[PDB]
């Protein structure tokens, strides 16, 4: 019943009143994302590439997504199911591939799409390729905060809702490393029942909601030099796209 943020994590759902906290142990699938950089001149097509180490075909959808990340700011969605245009989103962004191979095809390249790209699976749990920086050969300011800790330490994060129904909808936080790297760290079903964690922060990091009040949180405890990253909130829409992220708040841990 309760919506999930990944395709495998409706296994676990049980008619039963149960709480789950979930850890998958199935082979990880990896995302080769490439190149790792690359720079055109305005107007040329820019190419990036996934592989995934096992098929992405699952008769209920294809769940590859794309993001675009600037600096300073949360990724945004772009792709979702492999080739799906997100809404209001350029035409000139475009998706395709099946089994293990997709694409994304940006094309004419425009000054405004300097950025960095990732792909992303949301077959099992969720795993993101390393990123292409795509470098080109409206005055904005986009804040956030962040706090340094100990190791061993503690600390909880939050994230609000408003503007649709939060109840219904899976929420995730993913965390971004200093080397760029986005990590999955926690997902929690909507109704509050199934909670998911990758093994790298399990028995750490606590992943909770409440939908009385929409609120989201993260607990994390025994904090290691390892957790530092920027620590994203995010929903779980169509065909498990993450497609609403809220700005990052910064943990540093260090001693």
């Known amino acids: 019943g309760e919506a999930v943020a990944a395709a495998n994590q409706t296994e676990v759902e049980m008619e039963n009143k149960v709480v789950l906290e979930v850890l998958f142990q199935g082979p990880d699938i990896v995302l080769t994302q490439s190149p790792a950089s690359l720079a055109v001149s305005l107007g040329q097509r820019a190419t990036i590439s996934c592989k995934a180490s096992?098929?992405?075909?699952?008769?209920?959808?294809?769940?590859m997504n794309w993001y675009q990340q600037k600096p300073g700011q949360p990724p945004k969605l772009l792709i979702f199911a492999a080739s799906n245009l997100e809404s209001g989103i350029p035409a000139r962004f475009s998706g395709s591939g099946s089994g293990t191979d997709f694409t994304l095809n940006i094309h004419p390249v425009e000054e405004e799409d300097a950025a960095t790209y990732y792909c992303?699976?949301?077959?099992?749990?969720?795993?993101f390729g390393a990123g292409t920086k795509l470098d080109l050969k409206e005055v904005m300011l986009v804040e956030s905060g962040g706090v340094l800790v100990k190791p061993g330490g503690s600390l909880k994060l939050s994230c609000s809702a408003s503007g649709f129904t939060f109840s219904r909808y899976a929420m995730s936080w993913v965390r971004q490393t200093p080397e760029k790297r986005l990590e999955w760290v926690a997902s929690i079903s909507s109704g509050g029942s199934y909670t998911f964690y990758p093994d790298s922060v399990k028995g750490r990091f606590t992943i909770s909601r409440n939908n009385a009040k929409n609120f989201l949180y993260l607990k994390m405890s025994s904090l290691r030099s390892e957790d530092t990253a920027m620590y994203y909130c995010a929903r779980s829409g169509n065909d498990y796209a993450v497609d609403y992220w809220g700005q990052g708040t910064s943990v540093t841990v260090s001693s």
């Open positions: 992303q699976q949301s077959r099992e749990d969720l795993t």
């Open positions: 096992q098929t992405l075909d699952y008769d209920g959808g294809t769940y």
